[PDB]
Amino acid sequence: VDVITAIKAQNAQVAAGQLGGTPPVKGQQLNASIIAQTRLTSTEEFGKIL
Amino acid sequence: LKVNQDGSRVLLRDVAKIELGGENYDIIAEFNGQPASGLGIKLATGANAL
Protein backbone atom coordinates (compact mmCIF):
# COMPACT_ATOMS: atom_id res chain seq x y z
CA VAL A 1 0.00 0.00 0.00
CA ASP A 2 2.84 2.39 0.85
CA VAL A 3 4.58 1.62 -2.45
CA ILE A 4 1.37 2.22 -4.41
CA THR A 5 0.71 5.51 -2.60
CA ALA A 6 4.28 6.71 -3.14
CA ILE A 7 4.17 5.82 -6.84
CA LYS A 8 0.84 7.59 -7.28
CA ALA A 9 2.09 10.70 -5.46
CA GLN A 10 5.52 10.99 -7.10
CA ASN A 11 4.51 9.91 -10.64
CA ALA A 12 1.68 12.18 -11.78
CA GLN A 13 0.70 15.07 -14.04
CA VAL A 14 -0.39 18.19 -12.14
CA ALA A 15 -2.24 21.07 -13.76
CA ALA A 16 -0.34 24.22 -12.78
CA GLY A 17 -1.81 27.25 -14.56
CA GLN A 18 -0.50 30.10 -16.68
CA LEU A 19 1.49 33.30 -16.22
CA GLY A 20 -0.40 36.43 -17.19
CA GLY A 21 -3.50 34.33 -17.75
CA THR A 22 -6.88 35.85 -18.44
CA PRO A 23 -8.29 37.93 -16.84
CA PRO A 24 -4.99 39.87 -16.68
CA VAL A 25 -3.99 43.16 -15.08
CA LYS A 26 -4.22 46.35 -17.14
CA GLY A 27 -0.50 46.29 -17.97
CA GLN A 28 0.37 42.64 -18.51
CA GLN A 29 2.90 42.06 -21.31
CA LEU A 30 4.05 38.43 -20.90
CA ASN A 31 1.90 35.29 -21.08
CA ALA A 32 3.54 31.92 -20.45
CA SER A 33 2.25 28.47 -19.57
CA ILE A 34 3.36 27.06 -16.22
CA ILE A 35 4.76 23.52 -16.24
CA ALA A 36 4.76 21.48 -13.03
CA GLN A 37 5.13 17.86 -11.88
CA THR A 38 5.21 15.52 -14.88
CA ARG A 39 5.27 11.75 -15.18
CA LEU A 40 8.55 9.94 -14.59
CA THR A 41 10.53 8.70 -17.59
CA SER A 42 13.12 6.06 -16.58
CA THR A 43 13.73 3.24 -14.13
CA GLU A 44 16.21 5.47 -12.30
CA GLU A 45 13.51 8.04 -11.52
CA PHE A 46 11.15 5.35 -10.21
CA GLY A 47 13.90 3.84 -8.07
CA LYS A 48 14.46 7.27 -6.52
CA ILE A 49 10.84 7.44 -5.32
CA LEU A 50 10.97 8.09 -1.58
CA LEU B 1 -14.21 28.81 6.24
CA LYS B 2 -13.00 29.05 9.85
CA VAL B 3 -14.24 29.92 13.33
CA ASN B 4 -11.57 31.82 15.23
CA GLN B 5 -10.78 30.74 18.78
CA ASP B 6 -11.52 34.32 19.84
CA GLY B 7 -15.08 34.02 18.52
CA SER B 8 -15.00 35.86 15.21
CA ARG B 9 -16.29 33.93 12.20
CA VAL B 10 -14.29 33.79 8.96
CA LEU B 11 -16.38 33.96 5.79
CA LEU B 12 -15.52 33.35 2.15
CA ARG B 13 -15.88 37.06 1.41
CA ASP B 14 -13.19 37.74 4.03
CA VAL B 15 -10.55 36.03 1.86
CA ALA B 16 -11.89 36.45 -1.68
CA LYS B 17 -14.05 38.53 -4.01
CA ILE B 18 -17.26 36.76 -5.03
CA GLU B 19 -18.83 37.72 -8.35
CA LEU B 20 -20.57 36.52 -11.50
CA GLY B 21 -17.75 36.53 -14.03
CA GLY B 22 -17.22 33.92 -16.72
CA GLU B 23 -16.08 30.32 -17.15
CA ASN B 24 -13.35 31.62 -19.47
CA TYR B 25 -11.82 35.01 -20.25
CA ASP B 26 -9.92 34.09 -23.42
CA ILE B 27 -12.37 35.19 -26.15
CA ILE B 28 -13.35 38.87 -26.26
CA ALA B 29 -15.68 40.06 -29.03
CA GLU B 30 -16.20 43.60 -30.32
CA PHE B 31 -18.57 44.82 -33.02
CA ASN B 32 -17.50 48.12 -34.60
CA GLY B 33 -15.55 48.73 -31.40
CA GLN B 34 -18.51 48.11 -29.05
CA PRO B 35 -18.53 45.19 -26.58
CA ALA B 36 -20.40 42.22 -27.99
CA SER B 37 -20.84 38.47 -28.01
CA GLY B 38 -21.99 36.16 -30.78
CA LEU B 39 -22.47 32.67 -32.14
CA GLY B 40 -20.30 31.04 -34.78
CA ILE B 41 -22.95 28.68 -36.12
CA LYS B 42 -21.65 25.89 -38.35
CA LEU B 43 -23.70 23.95 -40.88
CA ALA B 44 -24.50 20.29 -40.34
CA THR B 45 -23.05 17.85 -42.85
CA GLY B 46 -25.38 17.44 -45.81
CA ALA B 47 -27.78 20.21 -44.78
CA ASN B 48 -29.35 23.02 -46.80
CA ALA B 49 -27.64 26.30 -45.91
CA LEU B 50 -30.63 28.46 -46.88
UniProtKB/Swiss-Prot annotation, chain B:
Induction: Positively regulated by MarA, Rob and SoxS transcriptional regulators (at protein level).
Mutant lacking the gene: phenotype: Loss of susceptibility to contact-dependent growth inhibition (CDI); inhibiting cells still contact the target.
Signal peptide: none
Localisation: Cell inner membrane
Biological function: AcrA-AcrB-AcrZ-TolC is a drug efflux protein complex with broad substrate specificity that uses the proton motive force to export substrates. (Microbial infection) Involved in contact-dependent growth inhibition (CDI), acts downstream of BamA, the receptor for CDI. Its role in CDI is independent of the AcrA-AcrB-TolC efflux pump complex.
Complex formation: Homotrimer, with large domains that extend into the periplasm, interacts with AcrA and TolC. AcrA may be required to stably link this protein and TolC. Interacts with AcrZ. Part of the AcrA-AcrB-AcrZ-TolC efflux pump.
Family assignment from sequence similarity: Belongs to the resistance-nodulation-cell division (RND) (TC 2.A.6) family.
Stated name of the protein: Multidrug efflux pump subunit AcrB
Native source organism of the sequence: Escherichia coli (strain K12)
